[PDB]
């Protein structure tokens, strides 16, 4: 009873070791002539072959270091561990996969760093009202979520060069306001004012000193400042094992990359630290504004969360800007608002409300699959992300590591990380391909008959035109020596047609499309299924008539995708909660819903019906969101008891229903304010009389 390991693993130990991960190999020489020397493990034990001479490497993933997680973010803990395990040793035989797991928790009382980037251009002269107080007020907010807070700031205007800067009178220098007869301050690209410190007293006395400057053109190019505040660690004073918050404030739109060509600046941003002892950006005049891609890369590497705090006019712009820079949130800066207090807190809370996994330095042939357990053993497949999280919550991820063939590279280590956190899971990767008998393979071609061959551990093979047990046949005139294993049957023709066969091992190829390999030379290595016009969609390798998919691709035709990003609704929930994501496209299951993300559902239970369960589990501690323990998760809305009335307001919708107690409950919810969607429930529901 022949099998897969028998046919493809004939020639050598290496060709054997990679067929299927279940295949084993045999040393010996004892002499199993016929009854193939490869097979698998205990099945190779038909002939005894018990000693270590049998080669069966087992793929494994072992934890080198796993520290327990942390309840708090204080200092007396050995260190702060938000991710377990930490180090994992991964060993893989060709075409095999082992799956491991990782836990991620955002610990409470985690130290926070906040660096303010202020726009000092003349347009912001009106907006300087909100920069007063601050570090005192910054404490009165962040005190709830954090102790050992550290703040500081810096300022930007625009590139101090034409045609941004007023050069026209000599008095325009040192006094950008000459015309219109006032006093400004000489403009600057970026300058670091106060390094991160625990002193809010010094902070307030600094910001107060800050004054407005003036440039000519409306886009202010604050992106230069964002870059330098990131890539320069020592100047800003960012602390590792701390939450990094960069808050950005401005009056109008901004300079993007390639804008600097008008100023005669053709040199792209290198993303290095150009801030010197004079605390100014030196390359401001000599190099261009950074592209979104570059500042995305550097923000991610330094684990810094960018925050846009902008005026009501330009807020729509930077929101759309933020969509191109993941992990960044925007908020409204205005006198009528929750202003600067809530804004930073709400932003930091929104930033800590999500967990997604970064992957750094992943090898080519290596592939990763992610199942995500977020809410009480739910196990969401194909997802690296977790939505709607509080602080102190813990999530789990199961990861499958797949390798295609073997690189024969020595060692490479990659990293698995939660976005914007120092805590990391480092995976050391090794590949087992070469057998342990590689050593002492003998120095030369001898030990068979004369030479021209080699020696490896079971066979010694032979050279170009010998190829036998010992050297023999092969370019001789072959009598019908035997039919031996040239077909997997008697009446069956010669080996896979294809240049027939002679004296045991088959000569097959020439050929056409490239190599034809096998015992019977039955493996194509070219001929394969096609999706449209292309073999394996172009997304996979063809091995013996089978498609081995490239990373991020799956399926028989390799036309299926691992991407959930195109399945993400505007609300942030996968397929709008109304469907399942398969092959990068949502398949809607719901009472008549459609659309790409399943955002469109013209006929659906409206409003209150969905939020009825929310007020029932939250306020009344009652049915069907209580039972699955999804209440605290699925309802993120803010519910407040209102007194015996609801004032006629701006646009809003009233809702009503009967509870299990046969009482009439009335409630309303605001549509969009900050996007808060606050719930107002009327106290004293209407009940019958006795």
């Amino acid at each position: 009873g022949p099998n897969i390991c028998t046919t493809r693993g004939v020639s050598s130990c290496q060709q054997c070791l990679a067929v299927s991960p279940m295949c084993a190999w045999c040393s010996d020489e004892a002499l199993p002539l016929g009854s193939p020397r490869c097979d698998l493990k205990e099945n190779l034990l038909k002939d005894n072959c018990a000693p270590e001479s049998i080669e069966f490497p087992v793929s494994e993933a072992r934890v080198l270091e796993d520290r327990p997680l942390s309840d708090k973010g204080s200092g007396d803990s050995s260190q702060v561990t938000q991710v377990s395990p930490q180090r994992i040793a991964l060993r893989l035989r060709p075409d095999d996969s082992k799956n491991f797991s990782i836990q991620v928790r955002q610990v409470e009382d985690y130290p926070v760093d906040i660096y303010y980037l202020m726009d000092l251009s003349y347009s912001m002269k009106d907006d300087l009202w909100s920069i007063q107080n601050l570090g005192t007020k910054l404490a009165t907010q962040m005190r709830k979520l954090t102790s050992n807070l550290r703040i500081g700031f810096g300022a930007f205007v625009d590139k101090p060069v034409s045609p941004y800067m007023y050069i026209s009178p000599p008095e325009a220098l040192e006094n950008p306001c000459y015309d219109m007869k006032t006093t400004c301050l000489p403009m600057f690209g970026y300058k670091h004012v106060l390094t991160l410190t625990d002193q809010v007293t010094r902070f307030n006395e600094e910001v107060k000193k800050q004054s407005v400057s003036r440039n000519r053109d409306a886009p202010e190019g604050g992106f230069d400042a964002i870059m330098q505040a990131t890539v320069c660690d020592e100047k800003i004073g960012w602390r590792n094992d701390a939450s990094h918050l960069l808050v950005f404030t401005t009056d109008a739109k901004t300079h993007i990359a390639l804008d600097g060509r008008l100023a005669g600046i053709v040199q792209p941003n290198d993303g290095q630290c150009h801030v010197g002892s004079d605390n100014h950006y030196s390359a401001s005049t000599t190099m261009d504004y950074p592209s979104l891609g570059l500042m995305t890369e550097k923000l991610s590497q330094k684990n810094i969360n960018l925050i846009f705090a902008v005026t009501e006019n330009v807020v729509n712009l930077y929101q759309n800007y933020s969509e191109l820079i993941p992990g960044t949130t925007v908020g409204v800066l205005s006198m009528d608002s929750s202003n600067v207090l809530q804004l930073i807190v709400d932003a930091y809370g929104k930033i800590r409300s999500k967990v997604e996994l970064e992957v750094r330095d992943l090898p080519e042939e290596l592939s990763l699959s992610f199942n995500a357990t977020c809410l009480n053993n739910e196990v969401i497949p194909g997802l690296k992300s977790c939505m709607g999280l509080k602080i102190g919550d813990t999530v789990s991820f199961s990861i499958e590591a797949k390798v295609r063939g073997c690189p024969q590279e020595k060692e490479k280590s990659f990293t698995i990380k939660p976005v914007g956190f120092k805590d990391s899971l480092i995976v050391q990767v090794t590949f087992d391909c070469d057998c342990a008998c590689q050593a002492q393979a003998e120095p030369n071609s001898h030990r068979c008959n004369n030479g021209n061959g080699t020696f490896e551990c079971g066979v010694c093979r032979c050279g170009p035109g010998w190829l036998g047990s010992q050297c023999e046949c092969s370019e001789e005139d072959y009598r019908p020596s035997q039919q031996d294993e040239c077909s997997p049957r008697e009446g069956q023709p010669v080996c896979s047609q294809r240049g027939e066969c002679l004296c045991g091992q088959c000569v097959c190829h020439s050929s056409d499309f490239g190599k034809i390999t096998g015992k019977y030379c039955e493996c194509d290595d070219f001929s394969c299924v096609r999706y449209k016009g292309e073999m394996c969609s172009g997304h996979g390798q063809c091995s013996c008539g089978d498609c081995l998919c490239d990373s991020d691709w799956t399926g028989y035709y390799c036309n299926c995708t691992t991407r959930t990003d195109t399945c993400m609704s505007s609300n942030g929930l996968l397929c709008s909660g109304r469907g399942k994501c398969e092959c990068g496209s949502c398949v809607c299951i719901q009472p008549g819903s459609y659309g790409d993300t399943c955002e469109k559902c013209p006929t659906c239970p409206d409003a209150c019906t969905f939020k009825k369960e929310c007020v029932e589990c939250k306020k009344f501690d009652r049915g069907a969101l209580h039972d699955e323990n999804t209440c605290n998760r699925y309802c993120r809305d803010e519910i407040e008891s209102v007194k015996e009335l609801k004032d006629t307001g701006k646009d809003a919708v009233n809702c009503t229903y009967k509870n299990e107690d046969d009482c009439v409950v009335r409630f309303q919810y605001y549509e969009d304010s900050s996007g808060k969607s606050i719930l107002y429930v009327v106290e004293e529901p209407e009940c019958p009389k006795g």
């Binding site: 347009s123 625009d158 000519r216």
Partner: peptide, 8 residues
């Protein structure tokens, strides 16, 4: 209400 460049 009405202005352009950096000014207001």
């Amino acid at each position: 209400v009405i202005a352009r460049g950096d000014w207001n």
